[PDB]
Design a binder for this molecule. Structure first.
Ligand SMILES: [Ca+2]
Ligand SMILES: [Ca+2]
Length: 452
């Protein structure tokens, strides 16, 4: 007969567009992720459907936009500033069980399914076992690890010692799943806790990067760089286990991020990484917070070493996988993604389209309520506090410094209206004018509030 495809999604947490060597970094050292890029297709215009953790994770699994899911902030969300211009919108504190995940869709084709690492889509019963997965390892309502060192006390991930590194032990448990299901068709959602705060790593590895951090100016944080090395080791271990088991040939790998790099977590004087050239990072609707790494190895279909400039989003993985597994798109599902198989096959037929964002919240990283649309090369951001819009040309201004909104006031009007129409198509919940808005004491004093 043929060879049913396996699927691994490797999802690094808060991993920036430029936090890998094959994406421009000179600090961070990511040799395995590089080998994956050389073995596959690297996407220059890949996006996360939301600039914070929970909703992007909900996007990936459902093929639906966060605004459409009504899960639009990280759970449970920034505390309300008592005096801001806006009251945050309410949202589901869980990925609802009535949403279909890619795991549920594969199950009936004989797939074994596991979610391992960061869940952050609600308390149990909204955990993975009740959402298409056979195995949960380390998933909870939590959006971060208490520590990167043992002992541990998480679901099916219980106990090591103060000398055991999380990223290392999580990887062993994922290898365990590969070893167990070596002969079966499987889907693995591998969501590292890396590289979310708190910054902790092996001392010897930190030392390496302090020696390199001298007069670096930009990407400067040794602990973080070490987190990335320990993460990159975990990725090689997966890649090379697939070799030892003689199934790399028919296993699809998708390597990406749930949002852009952290840089100025709420009133902290130091940034964690930098996304230059891109403006800002995690918690913002600027490209820093939404443009992410995306590498796809599909041995024998994706010509290795290729790249793709076409904009892709978290919503596209559901239908991509569905089609990779020989499934008819269910017309009752009403997803927001399209399949990337035409791009991966370097064939044509990939219809040109718009991407949408909707973040009716204040973020912990300086972000403010807004939405955005990207059509071809132009990108409009709408700021919900005062309805003002910014428009950038990302072919000429990837760093979003020159605002064209005054210069091209009709493309601005066109895109704002296209975005408003989408907001309606999905009944995006909007924020509200705060009755206790007091401009005097409305500054929340988060160091991320752009200037760039
Ligand atoms: Ca995240
Ligand atoms: Ca379900």
């Amino acid at each position: 007969p043929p060879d049913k495809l396996n699927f691994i999604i490797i999802l690094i947490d808060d991993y920036g567009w430029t936090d890998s060597t094959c994406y421009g970094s000179t600090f961070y050292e990511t040799p395995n992720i590089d080998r994956l890029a050389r073995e596959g297709m690297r996407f220059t215009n890949a996006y996360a459907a939301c600039p914070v953790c929970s909703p992007t994770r909900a996007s990936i699994l459902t093929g639906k936009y966060p605004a459409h899911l009504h899960l639009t902030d990280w759970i449970p969300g920034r505390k309300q500033w008592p005096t801001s211009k806006l009251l945050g919108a309410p949202f589901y504190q869980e990925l609802p069980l009535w949403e279909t995940t890619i795991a549920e869709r594969l199950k009936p084709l004989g797939y074994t399914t596991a979610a391992m690492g960061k869940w952050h889509l609600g308390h149990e019963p909204y955990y993975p076992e009740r959402q298409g997965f056979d195995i949960n390892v380390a998933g909870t309502f939590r959006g971060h690890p208490e520590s990167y060192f043992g002992p541990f006390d998480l679901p099916n991930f219980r106990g090591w010692t103060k000398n055991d590194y999380l990223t290392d032990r999580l990887t062993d448990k994922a290898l365990q799943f590969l070893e167990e299901n070596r002969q079966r068709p499987f889907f693995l959602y591998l969501a590292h806790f890396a590289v979310h705060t708190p910054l902790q790593a092996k001392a010897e590895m930190i030392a390496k990067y302090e020696r390199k951090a001298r007069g670096r100016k930009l990407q400067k944080n040794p602990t973080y760089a070490a987190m990335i090395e320990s993460m990159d080791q975990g990725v090689g271990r997966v890649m090379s286990k697939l070799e030892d088991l003689k199934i790399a040939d028919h296993t699809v790998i998708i390597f990406t991020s749930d949002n852009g790099g952290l840089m100025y977590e709420g009133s902290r004087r130091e940034p964690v990484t930098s996304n230059r050239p891109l403006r800002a990072g995690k918690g913002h609707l600027y490209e820093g917070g939404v443009r992410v790494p995306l590498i796809i190895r599909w041995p024998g279909v994706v010509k290795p070493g290729t790249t793709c400039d076409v904009p892709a989003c978290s919503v596209d993985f559901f239908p991509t996988i569905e089609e990779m597994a020989g499934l008819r798109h269910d017309p009752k599902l009403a997803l927001d993604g399209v399949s990337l198989t035409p791009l991966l096959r370097r064939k044509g037929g990939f219809k040109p389209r718009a991407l949408y964002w909707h973040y009716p919240h204040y973020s912990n990283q300086g972000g403010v309520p807004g939405g955005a649309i990207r059509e071809g090369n132009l990108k409009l951001i709408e700021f919900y506090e005062d309805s003002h819009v910014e428009l950038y040309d990302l072919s000429e201004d990837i760093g979003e410094r020159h605002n064209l909104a005054k210069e091209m006031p009709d493309k601005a009007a066109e895109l704002q209206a296209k975005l408003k129409a989408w907001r309606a198509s999905v009944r995006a919940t909007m924020p509200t004018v705060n009755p206790n808005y007091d401009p005097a004491r409305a500054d929340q004093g988060l160091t991320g509030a752009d200037p760039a």
